[PDB]
């Protein structure tokens, strides 16, 4: 799979668990088609989302449903949700790792890109 | 009430001319155009709206990082920062969104005073 | 010359009445008391040094956390975010060092001026 | 082993390798012993560095050489390391790992402590 998405929690020093993941990808009249999404682990993870064979070039969007997470664990949120955008591109083989760190008023997200 | 404030995590300076785009969610659920803008020489983005305009809503403040890098001569991995968010739910609030940029990373704070 | 900012992650807000020490290395290699102070209601410490005493050299700017969120009645991770850089050594600049702060996780970033 | 640390840069979005590492625990009269130290792999980890024995409570510090690391890439950084002082606290099963994500005039760090 050439797509991970890896979720962490700056309050509570943990994984992120059981955090709604949403990825689209963008299409020709510019609107956000869903493309893969899921739940992540115990470990805060993501995995099986794509395969190669779908997980073409273009422009995708991962939204992480950090409002809900916050909710469940009866902590204040900002956001409504963090939204990582990017272009996927074919520059030999590549395995993409969106990585987000979480905090009420606060985000850092980093791409993690490697063959 | 609305204020923007972006940082270049590899020069260590303001990131200076970052465009920005501030979107509303309409009844109908989609993003419409709500102000516009590009930060200063000192990396802030001051006067994007008024008290009278800028009422309860989800806005979406997107901001065009892509295009920051690409001036600098630098292919950076993200296309802009996202950052979507009620404002003014129990009356009205002062925001500053803050983002600290890296070509393969960002970070984004909001600071809410009364 | 020097300045120190620190946000709160949690609240969204500036971190009000954190502890600073700033301290230099000495010819001994030892770290030796420069200044301190603590982050006033915007979350920001000016004063802490002049264009005179803040001379080249390696500098340890320790931002008290724990005391901070302690203060808060929160447990947090970190004894403190110690930040350590050369300073002026092409001349002198003007330092901003500014910090964001959650309970198991902080960044700090470093804004450096002509 | 308890005690891991991870780290990433966010410049080339990437693990970041053979980063040296160095543990050092709090002695009685308040001076930094060295306690364990490393090279990260090219995953960006440095395992192995002590075992549950070792590993008691106590107040650590982990120094991570971001300026060698960032001068081998040929980037000018501003921070002579990254240093990361925490407490270890026995309460139940726990497992730590310091995670750090480099930029040259930024870094930030999180805890990620699991049973
Ligand atoms: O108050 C500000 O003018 C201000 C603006 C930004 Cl953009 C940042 C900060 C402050 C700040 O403390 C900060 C701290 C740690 C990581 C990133 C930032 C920022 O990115
Ligand atoms: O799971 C890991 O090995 C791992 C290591 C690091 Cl170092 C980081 C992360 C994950 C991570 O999600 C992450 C998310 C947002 C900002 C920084 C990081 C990291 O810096
Ligand atoms: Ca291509
Ligand atoms: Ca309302
Ligand atoms: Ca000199
Ligand atoms: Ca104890």
């Given at each position: 799979?050439?797509?991970?998405?890896?979720?962490?929690?700056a309050?509570?020093?943990?994984?992120?668990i059981?955090?709604?993941?949403?990825?689209?990808?963008?299409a020709?009249?510019?609107?956000?088609?869903?493309?893969?999404?899921g739940?992540?682990?115990?470990?805060?993870?993501?995995?099986?989302?794509?395969?190669?064979?779908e997980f073409?070039?273009?422009?995708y969007?991962?939204?992480?449903?950090?409002?809900?997470?916050?909710?469940?664990?009866?902590?204040?949120?900002?956001?409504?949700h963090?939204?990582?955008?990017?272009?996927?591109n074919?520059?030999?083989?590549?395995?993409?790792?969106?990585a987000?760190?979480?905090?009420?008023?606060?985000?850092?997200?980093?791409?993690?890109?490697?063959?």
């Open positions: 799979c050439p797509l991970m998405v890896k979720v962490l929690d309050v509570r020093g943990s994984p992120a059981n955090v709604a993941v949403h990825v689209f990808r963008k020709a009249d510019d609107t956000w088609e869903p493309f893969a999404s739940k992540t682990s115990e470990s805060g993870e993501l995995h099986g989302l794509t395969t190669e064979e073409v070039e273009g422009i969007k991962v939204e992480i449903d950090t409002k809900s997470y916050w909710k469940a664990l009866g902590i204040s949120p900002f956001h409504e963090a939204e990582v955008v990017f272009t996927a074919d520059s030999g083989p590549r395995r993409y790792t969106i987000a760190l979480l905090s009420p008023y606060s985000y850092s997200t980093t791409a993690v890109v490697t063959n």
